[PDB]
Design a protein around this ligand. Structure first.
Ligand code: LMN
Lengths: 193, 98, 367, 192, 48, 75, 217, 46
């Protein structure tokens, strides 16, 4: 049994991307085209109650580029308690320069002390730094006004956003057997129905 | 937090509270008013320009009133004059802003 | 983890059934008198400020999994004089309606069952002194959680219990920085004959007889700001079952269980105390405690923090509790939430408890 | 000295040109909440069902002790919401529905927003969010807990401690419709 | 393939045997998967 | 339009013109008793011994993320 | 520009869900309003889109044997050709290019009388997409798509009447090219024979409405 | 199904309800069934 039929199929039905969840929280939808994050007002729109995402960029629609949609889904049941804590720093260096120092931690509380394979709890931590520098460049507008038939006056802008993040994952101490993070391939409690 | 007991925690908390963010907001108002004066179009250029541009070389720029209000709010409710000497070390900055 | 928990009948009687007490770490024996003061301390119904009060409380169970599985409470109190009060409360745990269906022409008539568990109690409280009050309550408990099938009898199991409560509330006392108030309370709960779920005297379960002792203090500043700090201790008055062995391997355990189950509830109340070769420290592992802080603004906004700690040897119920309360004109709304701190999954996790009370009638001054 | 005293019908105008050392004005003093007014009000309905349920199914195989079932029926149908303010600084927005869906529709938000000059700029209790302007470190929108915002001049520190009520879910779409991947083995044919 | 010779729990007397004798630590498999990787790399050079 | 029937310790789901994707059966304690990601409108045989437990919760995930909840008595 | 190492991931990802690979990606998108390079009197909407990008993925584990780390396997090889094969076959490389001229049209004057033969009734769309890939399964993968569309529409403004009320027409040239050369994972000597899929299409539809009589249509 | 309303005030309403259903067996694979719900419901509007 080594021959594998592997494939995919696309389900559209109606206009808009069905994200598989209903009543998605506002601000939890992230759309990535080819490694770049799209803008919620220009490149796409979200109808939250029906869980529909409509791509608005004309070039992305006729592209065949795979589009990744991430979201938060509240339609979950039987899941472990998730504790989310952390802090964020937002120092303002100047009128056009901001630096941040986010730190976050998620801990899952397992139902029992035995974590079976697939139903695993995490104790992950992520910390990072970010920098945002948004300036106005009148030189670009001056260069644009040197073009054949352009006599514009709208400002030209530049924005540089850098970020670094570090993930330190772990497992909660509750699902530890004799001091080690343990995942049970088979504790044999689920056989013999 | 009382202004009449010269405790370390009380004095430090009052200094922190007058610096953050009463005096910060007052300084923001002061700088906004200064930029409004700088970006004015009241320059004559038909006579000698004043060396220091002012509001009237009336309109009553409200940013300076905001700065004055913040300085006043910092001076009272955060001044610690317990034994004839000011314990809050940020009050002179508030008077300078005023 | 949990080594040798105390086995009692109808454990639903031990669940907090109002959002106000739930937000204060499941304690009410020494908190301020309110409409919910029947599960915790009926003796403070004589200290009520309103003449009559009604209250509805909702505690959902398994909110993510299903609806209609909840513990509801309806309380009514009426203080007739300035010294005495009557109260009546009804707690009801239910799974909601469940339809029993075989395929069998799915338009066929179906039988709906509602497995449930309720307690109905009535209490009388009387003020002895101006600062002390006592109360006696009588409770009827019924359990109908079984569904009738073949070779399964779903007859309800019933029992009766009595409650003896005492509540002390001092007058306002001025101090250097605030004029606080003192409160104390005790409550002996669920004193009654064993409940037989199978209607056989040989197979009977102890009622969850309980002892609550608590004390609290009110920091009153500015006449508009209050901070009530309360501490409660709880001990089950049911004998602990035998454990690994208390000197033929299973014969010893069988004999120990035989001698444990053949203990009267009256004698079991006293057998709960002591029964250990050690001193007070060894018995302290059977004492649960709770500490609560309630900030009150203008007697109209309430913000409650609580911590409840059981010994992890028994039960393993350790949590923090958040609570909020609002009073519009005569309608008070309480909400409570629980953050578990135990290894065992708390059934009330990720659950918002709701409470709603109406106050009407005359108003009484507080001594 | 007339401005210092204040009770001279005109000293209020002159108090502006005074050294703030000589007077205290209450217009820039505020209590723990901005006022003493209470405005949190309820809207909706509450229902009690109290009665008896009686059932009798004539199944002869059942025990005579299961002849009929008489139970007490109690039901609650809370459809409440709370909206208002405490002292123009505390904002309360809550909604409780027993008939609602599983776990997140019952909302409760307490928002304490002090003056702009306070170190503590925002406290939130209940349904909170932690939005982050970051691509590598994603925030969370469906949280229940405590969120606090502190400001020191130009340094802003936002702390959160909560329980997350949602799960992150990702989909891949090409030319509109969502893509579903499948993996079968030869032994996994459609049998019978 | 992970093989371990088994020590036998001694019977004959009482039915109740302590867990340390029922589940001997000498009979417990505790395998580092890096050993499996090392064996796989070594067997890459072993002809079938 | 959705029905769950139990005849002899066997659970039988019936949906009119709706096709299910996943089924989960939980106890009153909240413990997951059974889970199948390959629902075919068929029957289900959960382990018959449940230590005095009769009430079960059946959660059905359909084609879309719609979830149908049914409380049943295991007989 | 993004650079991620082995072991990174989201807060919610489990032990087997975190990134078991090094990722180095970049993507540049340019949007030009070329119609602004022409005088505004005769307004041309000529938007130009140019997207380029590529990503390189180095797995933590060798795709062959699936459970030995790539660095460890490369260290314990002692054969330069085998080492080079192991290093090169593991890389998952994708490159994307997109050139778009969608929505090319001429707008009407503020007060202009529509005509059936006007160029303002036409719209033009051009799309070119190219994907170049090579990974453990395919040694060379090339996907080309070209889409040329010309749309026409005109609604006439006011035996039986024979003047159409509206006329529609749109043409489409759709060309899809796929070249798939599966790799020999053992030796980088020859590889498999390339496979070609081509979907060259020419589509056109037209339509017109008639109101011959006040009742007829 | 019998119902009876009474508005105790503008916000308070009390309804008495009584549902009585009897299904008689026509074929032996069905059992006769009697369901009687009765009681009161109190509605308070805000
Ligand atoms: C059978 C079962 C129970 C049904 C009994 C209904 C009685 C309703 C009582 C309403 C209540 C609590 C309501 C909240 C609790 C609801 C919680 C429900 C939750 C469901 C999940 C306040 O409600 C007040 O709301 C006011 C509106 O602002 C109204 O004021 C009215 O406006 C004008 C009229 O238009 C009038 O001129 C004006 O004088 C009113 O002031 C009144 O409606 C009422 O006073 C009780 O408070 C007060 O109501 C009065 C009677 O009014 C009661 O007096 C007694 O009532 C009967 C004693 O039994 C006796 O017959 C009667 O002789 C006796 O005088 C007292 O009790 C009293 O304390």
């Amino acid at each position: 049994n080594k021959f594998l039929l592997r494939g995919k199929y696309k389900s559209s039905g109606s206009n808009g991307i069905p994200i598989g969840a209903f009543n998605v929280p506002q601000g939890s939808v992230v759309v990535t085209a080819a490694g770049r994050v799209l803008v919620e007002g220009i490149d796409y729109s979200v109808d939250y109650q029906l869980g529909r995402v409509q791509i608005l960029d004309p070039s992305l629609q006729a592209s065949n580029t795979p589009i990744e949609v991430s979201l938060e889904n509240n339609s979950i049941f039987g899941q472990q308690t998730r504790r989310f804590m952390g802090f964020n720093i937002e120092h303002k260096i100047s009128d056009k320069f901001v630096i941040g120092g986010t730190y976050l931690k998620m801990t899952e509380r397992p139902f029992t002390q035995k974590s079976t394979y697939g139903q695993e709890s995490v104790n992950n931590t992520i910390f990072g730094f970010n920098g945002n520098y948004s300036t106005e460049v009148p030189f670009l507008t001056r260069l644009a006004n040197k073009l054949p038939n352009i006599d514009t006056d709208v400002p030209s802008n530049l924005s540089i956003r850098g970020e670094v993040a570090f993930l330190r994952p772990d497992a909660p101490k509750a699902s530890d057997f004799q001091g080690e993070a343990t995942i049970y391939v088979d504790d044999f409690e689920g056989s013999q129905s | 937090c009382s202004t009449k007991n010269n405790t370390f925690v009380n004095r430090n908390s009052h200094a922190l509270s007058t610096k953050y963010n009463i005096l910060y907001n007052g300084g923001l108002g002061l700088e906004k008013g200064l930029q409004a004066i700088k970006a004015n179009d009241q320059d004559n250029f038909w006579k000698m320009l004043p060396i220091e541009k002012m509001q009237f070389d009336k309109t009553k720029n409200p940013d300076f009133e905001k700065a004055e209000t913040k300085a006043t709010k910092a001076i009272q409710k955060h001044s610690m004059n317990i034994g004839g000497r000011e314990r809050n070390y940020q009050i002179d900055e508030a008077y300078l802003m005023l | 983890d949990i080594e040798r928990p105390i086995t009692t009948g109808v454990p639903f009687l031990l669940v907090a059934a109002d959002a106000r007490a739930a937000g204060l770490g499941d304690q009410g024996v020494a908190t301020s008198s309110d409409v919910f003061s029947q599960q915790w301390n009926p003796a403070k119904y004589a200290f009520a400020e309103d003449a009559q009060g009604l209250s509805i409380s909702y505690t959902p169970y398994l909110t993510d999994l299903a609806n209609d599985i909840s513990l509801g409470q309806v309380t009514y109190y009426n203080k007739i004089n300035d010294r005495s009060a009557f109260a009546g409360s009804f707690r009801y745990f239910g799974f909601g309606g469940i339809e029993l269906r075989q395929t069998g022409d799915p338009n066929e008539p179906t039988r709906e069952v509602n497995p449930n568990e309720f307690a109905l109690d009535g209490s009388y409280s009387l003020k002895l002194s101006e600062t002390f009050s006592m109360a006696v309550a009588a409770r009827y408990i019924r359990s109908n959680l079984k569904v009738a099938t073949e070779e399964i009898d779903a007859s309800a199991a019933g029992s009766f219990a009595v409650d003896v409560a005492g509540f002390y509330q001092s007058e306002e006392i001025a101090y250097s920085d605030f004029n606080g108030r003192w409160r104390a309370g005790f409550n002996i709960q669920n004193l009654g004959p064993k409940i037989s779920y199978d209607h056989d005297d040989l197979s009977a379960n102890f009622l969850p007889a309980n002892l609550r002792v608590g004390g609290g203090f009110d920091f009153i500043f500015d006449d508009y700001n209050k901070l009530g700090v309360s501490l409660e201790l709880t001990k089950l008055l049911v004998p602990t079952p035998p454990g690994p062995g208390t000197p033929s391997q299973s014969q010893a355990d069988e004999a120990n269980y035989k001698k444990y189950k053949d203990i009267g509830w009256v004698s079991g109340i006293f057998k709960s105390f002591g029964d250990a070769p050690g001193g007070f420290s060894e018995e302290l592992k059977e004492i649960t405690y709770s500490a609560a802080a309630e900030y009150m603004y203008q007697d109209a906004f309430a913000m409650r923090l609580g911590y409840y700690h059981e010994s992890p040897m028994k039960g393993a119920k350790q949590f923090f509790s958040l609570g909020a309360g609002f009073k519009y004109s005569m309608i008070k709304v309480d909400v409570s939430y629980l953050f578990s701190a135990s290894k065992v999954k708390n059934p009330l996790e990720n659950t918002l408890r709701f409470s709603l009370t109406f106050n009407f009638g005359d108003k009484y001054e507080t001594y | 000295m007339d401005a210092i005293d204040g009770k001279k019908t005109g000293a209020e105008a002159a108090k502006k040109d005074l050294l703030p050392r000589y007077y205290i004005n209450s217009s820039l003093f505020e209590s723990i909440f901005g006022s003493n007014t209470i405005d949190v009000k309820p809207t909706g309905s509450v229902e009690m069902d109290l009665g008896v349920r009686y059932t009798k199914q004539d199944n002869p195989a059942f025990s005579p002790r299961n002849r009929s079932s008489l139970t007490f029926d109690f039901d609650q149908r809370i459809s409440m919401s709370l909206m208002g303010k405490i002292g123009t600084r505390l904002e309360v927005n809550a909604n409780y529905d027993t008939q609602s869906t599983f776990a997140f529709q019952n909302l409760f938000k307490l928002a304490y927003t002090p003056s702009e000059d306070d170190i503590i700029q925002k406290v939130e209790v209940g349904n909170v969010s932690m939005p982050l302007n970051s691509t590598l470190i994603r925030g969370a929108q469906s949280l229940f807990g405590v969120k606090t915002q502190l400001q020191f001049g130009r340094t802003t520190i936002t702390g959160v401690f909560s329980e997350q009520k949602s799960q992150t879910k990702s989909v891949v779409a090409e030319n509109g419709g969502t893509v579903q991947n499948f993996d079968l083995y030869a032994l996994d044919y459609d049998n019978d | 393939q992970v093989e371990i010779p088994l020590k036998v729990t001694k019977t004959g007397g009482s039915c109740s045997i302590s867990p340390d004798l029922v589940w001997m630590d000498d009979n417990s498999i505790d395998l580092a998967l890096d050993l499996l990787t090392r064996m796989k790399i070594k067997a890459m050079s072993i002809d079938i | 339009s959705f029905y769950v029937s139990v005849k002899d310790k066997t659970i039988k789901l019936n949906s009119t013109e709706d096709v299910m994707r996943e089924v989960s059966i939980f106890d009153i304690s909240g413990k997951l008793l059974y889970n199948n990601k390959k629902v075919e409108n068929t029957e289900f045989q959960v382990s018959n011994f449940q230590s005095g437990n009769q009430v079960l919760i059946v959660k059905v995930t359909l084609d879309n993320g719609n979830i149908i909840t049914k409380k049943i008595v295991f007989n | 520009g993004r650079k991620s190492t082995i072991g990174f991931g989201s807060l919610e990802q489990g032990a087997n869900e975190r990134d078991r690979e090094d990722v180095q990606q970049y993507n540049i998108v340019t949007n030009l309003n070329l119609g602004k390079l022409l005088p505004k009197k005769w307004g041309i909407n000529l938007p130009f889109n140019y997207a380029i990008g590529e990503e390189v993925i180095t797995p933590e584990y060798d795709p062959f044997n699936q459970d030995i780390k790539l660095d460890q396997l490369i260290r314990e090889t002692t054969d330069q050709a085998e080492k080079d094969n192991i290093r090169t076959r593991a890389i998952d490389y994708t490159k994307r290019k997109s050139i778009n001229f969608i929505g090319v049209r001429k707008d009407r004057a503020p007060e202009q009388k529509p005509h059936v033969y006007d160029i303002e009734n036409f719209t033009f769309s051009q799309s070119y997409n190219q994907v170049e890939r090579h990974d453990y399964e395919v040694a060379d993968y090339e996907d080309e798509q070209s889409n040329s569309a010309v749309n026409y529409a005109y609604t006439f403004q006011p035996n039986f009447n024979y003047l159409p009320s509206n006329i529609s027409f749109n043409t489409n040239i759709l060309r899809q090219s796929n070249r798939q050369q599966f790799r020999e994972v053992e030796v980088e000597g020859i590889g498999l024979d390339p496979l070609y899929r081509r979907n060259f299409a020419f589509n056109y539809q037209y339509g017109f409405g008639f109101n011959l009589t006040k009742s007829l249509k | 199904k019998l119902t009876a309303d009474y508005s105790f005030s503008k916000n308070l309403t009390a309804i008495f309800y009584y549902d009585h259903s009897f299904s008689k067996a026509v074929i032996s694979t069905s059992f006769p069934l009697t369901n009687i719900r009765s009681g009161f419901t109190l509605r308070y509007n805000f």
